[PDB]
């Protein structure tokens, strides 16, 4: 189940880096080459999504009323209902993960830093349960990186 493992690594790191403002120094794993480039991709593409859907992200966050790990537990059920509706593409997977980072910054501001792990697990779980095969078809994270690769 390398896919759940790679995905969690990428998503947790992006969420953590986003909440704290600080890159993590610790080495990756099996395909940390891909993992790093996928993290670098999220930095550019994930950040843009946050800038452009700031209002909807704030509105979604406020309506969700997230205060603790408990409020986080219930998040995942709303997450899957919204996400598994409509069409699959890389853009919606990035919207998913980007709102995850938006929620993670909010958690940090409210002193719920440790809600960031289960949030990441919950995002990773939703994505992999509903999109595993599409992800496989796309060459998972290498495909992610290749599809979004632009000149710096
Ligand atoms: C992008 C987007 C666009 C719209 C939208 O509807 N935008 S809108 O129509 O342009 C518009 C509408 C209204 C207003 N304003 C209202 C005023 C209304 N009055 C007329 C009454 C108030 S403000 C307000 C109030 C409410 C909403 C918007 C704004 C305005 N506005 O004012 O600008 C513009 C709505 C939502 C999203 C959105 C948010 C977050 C995640 C997500 C996903 C990923 C899956 C879910 O992930 C998770 C789900 C749940 C939890 C998770 C946790 C972690 C990770 C992922 C999680 C997808 C997706 O995959 O599709 N979409 N999202």
Swiss-Prot record:
Cross-link (Glycyl lysine isopeptide (Lys-Gly) (interchain with G-Cter in ubiquitin)): 23, 26
Motif BH1 location, chain numbering: 81-101
Processing and modification events after translation: Cleaved by CASP3 during apoptosis.
Outcome of mutating residue 37 to R: No effect on ubiquitination
Induction: Expression increases early during phorbol ester-induced differentiation along the monocyte/macrophage pathway in myeloid leukemia cell line ML-1. Rapidly up-regulated by CSF2 in ML-1 cells. Up-regulated by heat shock-induced differentiation. Expression increases early during retinoic acid-induced differentiation.
BH2 (motif): residue ranges: 133-148
Compartments reported by the entry: Membrane; Cytoplasm; Mitochondrion; Nucleus, Nucleoplasm
UniProt motif BH3: location: 38-52
Protein origin, superkingdom: Eukaryota
Assembly, per entry: Interacts with HIF3A (via C-terminus domain). Interacts with BAD, BOK, BIK and BMF. Interacts with PMAIP1. Interacts with BBC3. Isoform 1 interacts with BAX, BAK1 and TPT1. Heterodimer of isoform 1 and isoform 2. Homodimers of isoform 1 or isoform 2 are not detected. Isoform 2 does not interact with pro-apoptotic BCL2-related proteins. Interacts with RTL10/BOP. Interacts with BCL2L11; may sequester BCL2L11 to prevent its pro-apoptotic activity. Interacts with GIMAP5 and HSPA8/HSC70; the interaction between HSPA8 and MCL1 is impaired in the absence of GIMAP5.
Family designation: Belongs to the Bcl-2 family.
Function: Involved in the regulation of apoptosis versus cell survival, and in the maintenance of viability but not of proliferation. Mediates its effects by interactions with a number of other regulators of apoptosis. Isoform 1 inhibits apoptosis. Isoform 2 promotes apoptosis.
Protein's UniProt name: Induced myeloid leukemia cell differentiation protein Mcl-1
Residues of the full protein shown: 172 to 323 of 350
